Structures are given as C-alpha cells and as structure tokens.
Amino acid sequence: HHHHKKIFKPEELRQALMPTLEALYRQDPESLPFRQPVDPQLLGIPDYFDIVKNPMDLSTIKRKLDTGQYQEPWQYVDDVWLMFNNAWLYNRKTSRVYKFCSKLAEVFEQEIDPVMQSL
Ligand SMILES: CO[C@H]1CC[C@H](n2c([C@@H]3C[C@H](F)C(=O)N3c3ccc(F)c(F)c3)nc3cc(-c4c(C)noc4C)ccc32)CC1
Numbered sequence: 001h002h003h004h005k006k007i008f009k010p011e012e013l014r015q016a017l018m019p020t021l022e023a024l025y026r027q028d029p030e031s032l033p034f035r036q037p038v039d040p041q042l043l044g045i046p047d048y049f050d051i052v053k054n055p056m057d058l059s060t061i062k063r064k065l066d067t068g069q070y071q072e073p074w075q076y077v078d079d080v081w082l083m084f085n086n087a088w089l090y091n092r093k094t095s096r097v098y099k100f101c102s103k104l105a106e107v108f109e110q111e112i113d114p115v116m117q118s119l
Pocket residue numbers: 029032033034036038043045086087090091096097100
C-alpha cells in the first residue's frame with residue numbers, strides 16, 4: 001500500500017483520464033446539460049456570467065485532453081470541479097440541473113481517487 005514537479009504526455013493523460021470523462025457522458029439524462037457550454041442568450045438568463053466568472057463544460061474538457069492542453073492530472077480534476085461548482089453556485093437546490101450536477105459529482109468522486117493513485 002502507498003498513498004501518492006512531474007510532467008505527463010497527452011497520450012498518458014488520455015489513456016488514464018478519458019475513461020473518467022466517458023463515465024460522466026454515459027450518465028443519461030444527467031450529463032445532457034453539461035455536454036455543451038452554457039448559452040445565456042438561448043436560455044434567456046442574462047445574469048449567468050455575473051455569478052460564474054469562469055465557464056466549464058464536458059465538450060471543453062474533451063478538447064483539452066484531445067489537443068494535449070493538460071500536463072499534470074490535477075489540471076483536468078480542477079476543470080471538472082469548476083464545472084460542478086459553477087452549476088451548484090448558479091442553479092437552485094430544487095432544480096433538476098443541480099440534482100443532475102450532484103449525481104455526476106458522486107460518480108466522479110467514486111472513480112477519480114483510484115485513477116490518481118495509478119499516476
Ligand atoms: C443539448 O442542448 C442543451 C440542452 C440543455 C439546455 N439547458 C437547459 C434547458 C432549458 C430548461 F431550463 C431546461 O429544462 N433545459 C433542459 C433541457 C434538457 C435537459 F436534459 C435538461 F436537464 C434541462 N437548461 C440548462 C441549464 C444549464 C446550466 C448548467 C449546466 N449550469 O447552469 C446552467 C444554466 C445548461 C444547459 C441547459 C441547453 C441546450
């Protein structure tokens with residue numbers, strides 16, 4: 001047993017972290033709201049960017065893995081938490097979106113720890 005200034009390759013991170021991202025995409029219908037960037041104009045919520053200073057969604061995180069924009073695995077993890085925190089901050093606790101956020105966050109919390117241990 002062993003509970004674990006380092007640099008990983010894009011291929012190393014995709015092999016390790018894409019299966020965790022795919023686990024999120026497979027949660028249906030819970031992932032549908034997180035697949036594309038929030039569009040305040042389409043959704044008629046011009047107050048969105050007054051609460052969320054830094055947008056995040058699954059499509060953005062998929063591009064970053066796919067184009068080698070992550071170098072340490074904690075860079076991927078922070079973006080995913082940014083996505084869930086944004087959603088938890090902006091939406092009311094009673095809304096379907098907040099509860100969808102909570103299910104995704106559970107599913108992420110219960111798979112990322114082992115994956116980190118393997119890197
Ligand atoms: C695939 O097209 C998208 C479907 C979800 C649509 N959507 C919708 C639409 C509008 C309506 F509120 C609604 O019920 N939507 C909705 C549509 C499909 C769903 F599966 C779902 F859970 C919700 N609401 C969204 C909310 C968010 C959101 C997130 C994530 N964090 O803060 C906010 C605000 C994001 C997307 C939302 C936008 C288009």
